[PDB]
């Protein structure tokens, strides 16, 4: 029953810090758990962040999730940007009826 | 190469009504049929709904499938919850090449 | 329609070679593609083999499928077994009207 608005695309140079936003149109973005998925070209999506900021085993501590009460959005921050980090990133959450909503995705480019 | 993400674990009482959702990350949900499988503890996946809303002979009409293109999701409704209904539910569909794609699953426990 | 009969749970040591069988009750096991899914504990089914012997990118060449015309059954072989290969394996195919048929699954135990 709501939308999750992300950034269309983000570019950045290796070694730097990137932060992708995911804004919820209605209701507190903190009402339901926010997951983040990475989708490398020609590969299926994998979970990089779940439950707002928990990291599945394997995923380097370079990925970190946070929720910004200030602007009603979730955010994915990548530190020490690497070339393999290039891919599409999707945020996802639920509404009170347990429906699944995906953001439109954010293609991150490593220059 | 998309993903199917379903509702988070659900708990409810017998005789009650529940709905498990499954949203497609990208591409149109109505591009390919959506199937639902019930997987009871230590058992193999069996079909409760195929071709979006068809119940195979044997599956009671307590299970109902529907598709919502505006949300790009699919839904399984179980009315008249019984304890034997306790299982993991998985939605599934096909991609461009006709290869199978499974959702992460939804744990349903009948109180 | 037809049912798929899989091998009784199997256990083998690391580095050795296991072969799981999937037999079709009636009809040719080759009349329709056979797929194999790996389902690790608490996870959803993931493809290791599709279209009888094709491997999804990402899946190790340690997994290989085949169709044994001498026994009318599909075969899933895993060479150089790994501890992380422990899980349930399921074979699946279709019927005349392209309806999904799951095998009963085989528990693989790496000692």
Describe what you observe in this structure.
Three copies of one chain form a homotrimer. With 111 residues, chain A is mainly β. The first copy, chain A, has a single domain, classed as Immunoglobulin-like. In chain A, 0% of the residues lie in helices and 46% in strands. The first copy, chain A, is built from no helices and ten strands. In chain A, strands 2, 4, 5, 8, 9 and 10 form a six-stranded mixed β-sheet that branches. In chain A, strands 1-3-7-6 form a four-stranded antiparallel β-sheet, with no helix packed on it. The radius of gyration of chain A is 13 Å and the shape is globular. At the A-B interface, strand 4, strand 8 and strand 9 of A face strand 3 of B. The PDB classes it as immune system. Keywords: Lambda VI subgroup, light chain variable domain, beta-sandwich, immunoglobulin, AL amyloidosis, immune system. The assembly is trimeric.
What labels would you give this structure?
homotrimer, 111 residues, mainly beta, Immunoglobulin-like, six-stranded mixed beta sheet, four-stranded antiparallel beta sheet, 10 strands, 46% strand, globular
Largest sheet of chain A: 6 strands, mixed
Secondary-structure element pattern of chain A, one letter each: EEEEEEEEEE
Global structural class of chain A = mainly beta
Q: Classify the fold: give the CATH topology of chain A.
A: Immunoglobulin-like
Q: Shape of chain A from CA axes? A: globular
Topology, number of strands of chain A: 10
**Measured distance between first and last alpha carbons of chain A:** 37 Å
CATH homology-level superfamily of chain A: Immunoglobulins
The residue fraction in helices of chain A comes out at: under 10%
Q: Biggest interface pair, residues each?
A: A-B, 18 and 17 residues
Identify the CATH architecture of chain A: Sandwich
Given the structure, what is the number of helices of chain A?
Answer: 0
Determine Rg of chain A (CA atoms, Å): 13 Å
**Proportion of residues in extended strands of chain A:** over 45%
| CATH class designation of chain A | Mainly Beta
Subunit organisation of the chains: homotrimer
Number of domains of chain A: 1
PDB class: immune system
Keywords: Lambda VI subgroup, light chain variable domain, beta-sandwich, immunoglobulin, AL amyloidosis, immune system
Assembly: trimeric
Entry title: Crystal structure of the unstable and highly fibrillogenic Pro7Ser mutant of the Recombinant variable domain 6AJL2
């Amino acid at each position: 029953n709501f939308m999750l608005t992300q950034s269309h695309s983000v570019s950045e140079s290796p070694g730097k810090t990137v932060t992708i936003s995911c804004t919820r149109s209605s209701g507190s973005i903190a009402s339901n758990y926010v997951q983040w998925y990475q989708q490398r070209p020609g590969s299926s999506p994998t979970t990089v962040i779940y439950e707002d900021n928990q990291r599945p085993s394997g995923v380097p501590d370079r990925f970190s999730g946070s929720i910004d009460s200030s602007s009603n959005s979730a955010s994915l921050t990548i530190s020490g940007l690497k070339t393999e980090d290039e891919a599409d990133y999707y945020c996802q959450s639920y509404d009170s009826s347990n429906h699944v909503v995906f953001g439109g995705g954010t293609k991150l480019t490593v220059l």
